[PDB]
Amino acid sequence: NQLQYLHKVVMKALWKHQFAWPFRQPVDAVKLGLPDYHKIIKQPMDMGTIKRRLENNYYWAASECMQDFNTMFTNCYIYNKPTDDIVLMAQTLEKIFLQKVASMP
Amino acid sequence: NQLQYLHKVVMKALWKHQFAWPFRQPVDAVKLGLPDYHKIIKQPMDMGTIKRRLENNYYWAASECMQDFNTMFTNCYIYNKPTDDIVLMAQTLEKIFLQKVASMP
Numbered sequence: 001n002q003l004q005y006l007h008k009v010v011m012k013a014l015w016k017h018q019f020a021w022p023f024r025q026p027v028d029a030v031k032l033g034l035p036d037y038h039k040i041i042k043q044p045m046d047m048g049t050i051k052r053r054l055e056n057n058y059y060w061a062a063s064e065c066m067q068d069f070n071t072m073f074t075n076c077y078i079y080n081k082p083t084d085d086i087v088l089m090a091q092t093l094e095k096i097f098l099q100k101v102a103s104m105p
Numbered sequence: 106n107q108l109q110y111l112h113k114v115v116m117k118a119l120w121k122h123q124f125a126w127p128f129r130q131p132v133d134a135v136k137l138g139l140p141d142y143h144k145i146i147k148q149p150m151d152m153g154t155i156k157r158r159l160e161n162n163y164y165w166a167a168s169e170c171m172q173d174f175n176t177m178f179t180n181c182y183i184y185n186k187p188t189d190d191i192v193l194m195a196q197t198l199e200k201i202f203l204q205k206v207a208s209m210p
């Protein structure tokens with residue numbers, strides 16, 4: 001019921017979102033040219049991974065899925081500079097995530 | 106019911122927590138010697154403010170209170186360096202926040 005909601009309502013909205021594109025797949029540190037990314041960020045996470053996990057019944061509790069969303073956003077804030085656009089993008093998506101989590105069954 | 110839960114269960118646990126102390130009052134940029142804090146962080150938030158707001162029935166929806174917790178943690182990640190202790194402290198508290206939010210009525 002709760003994981004159904006996270007998949008059917010929360011992920012549906014965030015995946016579609018205008019600012020979703022950077023978070024749809026794992027950060028490729030080599031392509032992006034970020035040699036220090038995996039030195040700073042120890043637990044990478046992204047929406048593609050969360051989506052697969054929801055589809056394949058990976059999670060046992062809603063909170064596990066919620067923690068993955070949180071880790072995704074947090075990594076972005078920790079690695080990037082405050083003035084970066086990605087930071088505003090993460091904030092916008094996280095706000096919507098928390099709003100819908102408040103309405104979870 | 107939901108705001109009661111946020112006050113009685115969520116705030117109760119986080120306020121007591123070992124790592125709560127830096128977040129119990131607004132960041133005093135002058136005392137802490139952070140001249141650029143309010144240039145970078147545009148919406149300051151802290152647990153003291155959230156606690157007063159819960160006590161005084163300030164909030165209309167649980168999500169408003171949840172957004173304040175999120176803003177508090179996010180500010181910490183954006184302003185501080187990745188290796189700072191406060192960053193680990195925020196992560197620990199945020200994990201507990203999200204865990205209890207998953208059990209909200």
Ligand SMILES: Cc1nnc2n1-c1ccccc1C(c1ccccc1)=N[C@H]2NC(=O)OCc1ccccc1
Pocket residue numbers: 021022023027032033034075076079080085086
């Ligand atoms: C997700 C995520 N998390 N971080 C990043 N993405 C990301 C993932 C996939 C694609 C893009 C991005 C964007 C991005 C997103 C949107 C707009 C602009 C940028 N930015 C990436 N970070 C970056 O390029 O760091 C700059 C840097 C480089 C070297 C050293 C220090 C700092």
Ligand SMILES: Cc1nnc2n1-c1ccccc1C(c1ccccc1)=N[C@H]2NC(=O)OCc1ccccc1
Pocket residue numbers: 126127128132137138139180181184185190191
């Ligand atoms: C909350 C919160 N958010 N940021 C900070 N606190 C905070 C609030 C109240 C009290 C302490 C702290 C601690 C803290 C907390 C715990 C342990 C260590 C530190 N650190 C503060 N930041 C800081 O000193 O920046 C270093 C800096 C200075 C100048 C320039 C650049 C960077």
